[PDB]
Structure 1
């Protein structure tokens, strides 16, 4: 089974104000951590059997242990095993090995001298895949996202609600959506939403770049994708986030480009994993891309990617929410009227609002002030907002 390896996270300490309540909650966290440290330190200290078992098994197998590939199972205790050098050896299977675990192609621990099967290596996970697993959940939560109520609701119905409440889906008869593509202009909150869902989820989370799943050697790309998805299968409730799928999701086309055909083969293996022969199981996929129109139709089609969540440039209410969230830790003055920044049509995104807040803080620091003002925000708006050149036509239209 090998249930999910959910990322560990400390409880959120709120209020975020530098008050005594935050001190008390943080000191409660420190208290419990010290309790855990004391118990885990005095556990092995007071430890006075299985040592005979270890002294027999380890002595019999000996060190070092070679790692080979099982090729054939001839007898109940004899196997043809190929070493990493590609040389096959007819070796013996020692008694202290589960015969049901031995399968062709499995990674098998052999003795160094006689290469006899001393055990089976379970994980044998590519290091480029085990690094995709998330161990420390990101600090961003659903409370750090301003607006985006529809997008958050869709992503929760897709990858969150089925885990907590599969009762609705089972009762009505729907198979819950198992693929979501977060597409929109950059800086709108796609990666932020991925961070938030990773923080909230109780299922294992795999983060991919859409470009680290691509390897030098000819066949290692699709093989790496298959390994990643198999690992996702192992920890049954899983979420596989592939940021910037544009890297491999680009539309298929015919050209010589010996590397591009491997690119397309890798993406073909990806879409086979998403929806092909054999079921995919209880593993959700979240994909993010700035440009969706350049993606291959067979990748973003329903059944492979069930939902296409659009992240538009924030509107007035959403922008006001972003400003309220990102100046929450600030010390605003009384003359500040955030509205003037929220209005007008600068086409500023959530990342733009974050930079506006940061630059207003820097402007206040320039005047040796730890509290921001309206003038600082106004200066920061023009200082940071200068991104696009023209983006507009002339006075043709009345």
Structure 2
């Protein structure tokens, strides 16, 4: 009954929110400042205390020391180089050569060492964050999961069963098969379960414009890999980062090959990465260079093939568990109808077969809806199918 009475008394208090929130001070929307009620404790003290005693302390780079005396040699970004000194607040220990240090503008002396340069495009491919794919969702390839998982996490979760036995566990592993087989999806489960630094690399990101520019990204990558205690490096589509050296006449594709050779040298030869585990993934493994195929770099060579029957039925149980269906259907008939198929194709049959129930007006799909999915996805889209020339990997 109080139709306007709740309206205007609602509205003058919804406006009267703003009518005193202007009296608070939230207004004068900025160009990059902050709210007025926050920093109010750097108001009289740190305004004259983080400013008036506090310096600028320009950062530099050390060339070298010399004996018997401090007498360091500095280097800066563009300007000249100097003979410089410590402060009293620093020990002469951690002023090792090739280091960035903070330096005052007047006496030009050293205040604090700095962390080295990281080239933060390498920092961009640190994953920082984990996907949600469970090893439950990678059904059909259980022994591949186990044979991978014993290489990936068992020394990391238990570095005693390998020590007390007296073996060094293998460090390198690649994954390969036809496309859509569950390789990338299988890697997402590893990034789900693990805990160390998972630094992903997609191989096409390393193609640079300059000469040898990608190799420095490799070097910085393995440096910040060496900074951590244990680390996991992921590789994807490494056919782009190198197939093989073949060169003749006009030198083509050389810039990729120098990057691939730098990857070889960072994997083996003169002091091993130590506690760094790598993981590759490709579509066609035939093109890859045999020195890259050497163990000590690529110890495990997990195959991903098509599921026989039972892996397929298990995949139907995975992609079909979470949808409203007719109860008394069978999946075994469908796995009889899909001899050569991927889990992507099985998933597309499920996600299409729901849409067949969405076609007319129902809520739960049927066996004949599945039959409408099978001939369409398999046999109507069978013109392309993407698989057979990748079975031979050509």
TM-score (norm 1): 0.77
Tell me what 1:129 maps to. Answer: 122
2:177 to 176, 181, 184: 184
Q: Give the root-mean-square deviation of aligned CA atoms.
A: 3.0
Contact 2:242 2:256 in 1 (8 A): no
Q: Could you tell me whether the CA contact under 8 Å between 1:360 and 1:372 is conserved in 2?
A: yes
- Cα distance in 1 between the residues matched to 2:234 and 2:63: 34
1:299 and 2:299 correspond? no
Query: Are 1:372 and 2:365 counterparts?
Result: yes
TM-superposed CA distance for 1:213, in Å, is 3.0
Cα distance per residue 1:251-275 (max 9 Å; x no partner): 1222466672221111111111111
Corresponding residue for residue 12 of structure 1:
none
1:2-41 matches, cutoff 5 A: none
Deviations 1:31-86 (A, max 9, x none): xxxxxxxxxxxxx9xx9xxx99xx69x877723x5443321224765432322337
Cα offset, 1:283, TM superposition: 0.9
- Between the aligned partners of 1:89 and 1:371, the Cα distance in structure 2 is 79
2:202 equivalent to 1:199 = no
Distance 1:274 1:135, change over 3 A: same
Q: Does the CA-based 8 Å contact 1:69-1:81 persist in structure 2? A: yes
In structure 1, what is the Cα distance between the partners aligned to 2:249 and 2:72? Answer: 44
Trace 1:91-110 onto structure 2 (pairs within 5 A). 91-97=84-90, 99-110=92-103
Which runs of 5 or more structure 1 residues have no equivalent in the other structure?
1-43, 393-398
Q: Provide the secondary structure at the position in 1 that maps to 2:160.
A: helix
Give TM-score, length-normalised by structure 2.
Answer: 0.78
Moved more, 221-230 or 287-296: 221-230
Query: Does residue 1:249 correspond to 2:242, yes or no?
Result: yes
Q: By percentage of residues, which structure has more helix?
A: 1
**CA pair 342-226 structure 1, distance change in 2 beyond 3 A:** same
Structure 1 distance, partners of 2:230, 2:140, is 28
- Aligned pairs for 1:319-398 (under 5 A) are 319-385=312-378, 386-389=381-384
Segments of structure 2 that go 5 or more residues without pairing to the other structure are 1-37, 389-394
Q: 2:145 aligns with which of 152, 163, 170?
A: 152
Q: What is the distance in 1 between the residues matched to 2:316 and 2:105?
A: 63
Residues 1:70 and 2:62 are matched in the alignment: yes
Structure 1 residue matching 2:240: 3-state secondary structure? helix
Are 2:78 and 1:81 equivalent residues in the alignment? no
Q: Name the counterpart of 1:272.
A: 265
C-alpha deviation, 1:310, in angstroms: 0.5
